[PDB]
């Protein structure tokens, strides 16, 4: 009858992963491990972090910006002024045209004083932010969330090292506050009446979408959304809805897993259906150092040997998002 299915998303609690039972521990790897070989995604629960803070903050923002911010804030792709902000700033709204829009901000030990940013090296940026007094606490609430996030996405990686039989930093020792990569971006995705069809895409199976398919450029991605359906992710009987949790963060493998795996966890496809609502969409790209290589691996094997080729991270990263925007459109 072409109806649709709902995807498996177990909810995990992960509180044991920041704790010192190693065998609970363990518990929750065989879980998360569970989940990458199922469909790839899984809700974390018992994570710590106030997201009704964080939602009521970012739609604060959201719904106070105004144009002439936004212009200021925007990254290259909307303003020829700002060639240096590929990744971090506004992305604009077009009405009639895009429903979406976007604010990206990177590591806050990104600045001028940063080695990485006096060597001019791609993808790292100094964030922007708007004015204080326009927005007051908006920026100590954003970047005090990347570090609760960061924090959080740390112990998930400890579960993702123990789930692949390894030791529990294998992944988190390359995820460190002096170089880390990762980015939060605060997705707006609104309410609009008329919406514009020019803004919807029609899926090869008829769905109608606001964003194509696609997989993460990440090591994982943690995610936290409003309380409306909107993601499928793609299986081999088709795609699966993936219900809708706001007090929980929605994680998953990003291409970086699936290579370093030899595709052990699969990097999983998701697409997000059109659904005239306004919410939100709050990953954070749980991204390493510029210059991080993990030796690749097959769980599978006996020997663990795999003949894939170490990858550096930052060179994955930036070939990545160019893709990304390539295939996807520009966000
Ligand atoms: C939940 C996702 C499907 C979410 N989309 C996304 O996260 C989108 C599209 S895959 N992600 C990206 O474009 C990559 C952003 C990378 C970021 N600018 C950076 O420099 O690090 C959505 O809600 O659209």
């Known amino acids: 009858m072409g109806s649709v299915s709902k995807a498996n998303v177990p909810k995990i609690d992960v509180s044991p992963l920041f704790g010192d039972d190693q065998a609970a521990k363990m518990r929750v790897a065989q879980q998360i491990d569970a989940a990458s070989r ?3 995604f899984f809700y974390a629960v018992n994570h710590g972090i106030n997201v009704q803070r964080l939602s009521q903050k970012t739609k604060e923002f959201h719904m106070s910006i105004t144009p002439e911010e936004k212009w200021d804030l925007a990254i290259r792709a909307y303003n020829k002024e700002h060639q240096d902000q590929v990744r971090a700033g506004y992305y604009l709204s077009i009405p009639g045209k895009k429903a979406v829009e976007s604010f990206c901000y990177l ?5 001028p004083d940063h080695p990485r940013i006096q060597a001019k090296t791609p993808t790292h940026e100094v964030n922007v932010w708007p004015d ?3 927005h007051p606490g908006f920026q100590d609430f954003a970047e005090q969330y990347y570090w609760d996030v960061f924090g959080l996405s740390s112990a998930l990686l400890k579960g993702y090292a123990l789930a ?4 529990e930093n294998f992944f988190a020792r390359h995820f460190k506050p002096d170089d880390t990569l990762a980015s939060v971006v605060l997705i707006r ?15 090869a199976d008829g769905t109608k979408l606001s964003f194509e398919w696609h997989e993460d450029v990440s090591l994982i991605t943690v995610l936290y959304q409003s309380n409306v359906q909107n993601l499928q992710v793609e299986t081999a009987a088709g795609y699966q809805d993936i219900e809708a949790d706001d007090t929980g963060y929605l994680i998953n493998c990003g291409s970086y897993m699936a ?3 030899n ?4 990097a999983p496809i998701a697409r997000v259906k059109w659904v005239n609502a306004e919410r939100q969409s709050l990953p954070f790209f749980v991204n390493l150092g510029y210059d991080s290589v993990i030796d690749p691996f097959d769980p599978r094997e006996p020997n663990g040997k795999s003949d894939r080729e170490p990858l550096s991270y930052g060179d994955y990263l930036q070939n990545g998002l160019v893709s990304l925007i390539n295939k996807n459109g520009q966000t």
């Not at 590591?107 to 600045?111: A, E, G, Y």
């Not at 595709?263 to 699969?266: F, P």
């Open 132 to 134: 204080e007094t326009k």
């Open 189 to 203: 995705y609104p309410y609009l009446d008329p919406y514009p069809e020019a803004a919807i895409k029609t899926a």
């Open 164 to 167: 692949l039989g390894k030791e």
């Open 107 to 111: 590591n806050p030990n990104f600045t």
């Open 259 to 261: 290579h370093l795996t």
């Open 263 to 266: 595709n052990y966890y699969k």
């Open 38 to 40: 199922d469909t790839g």
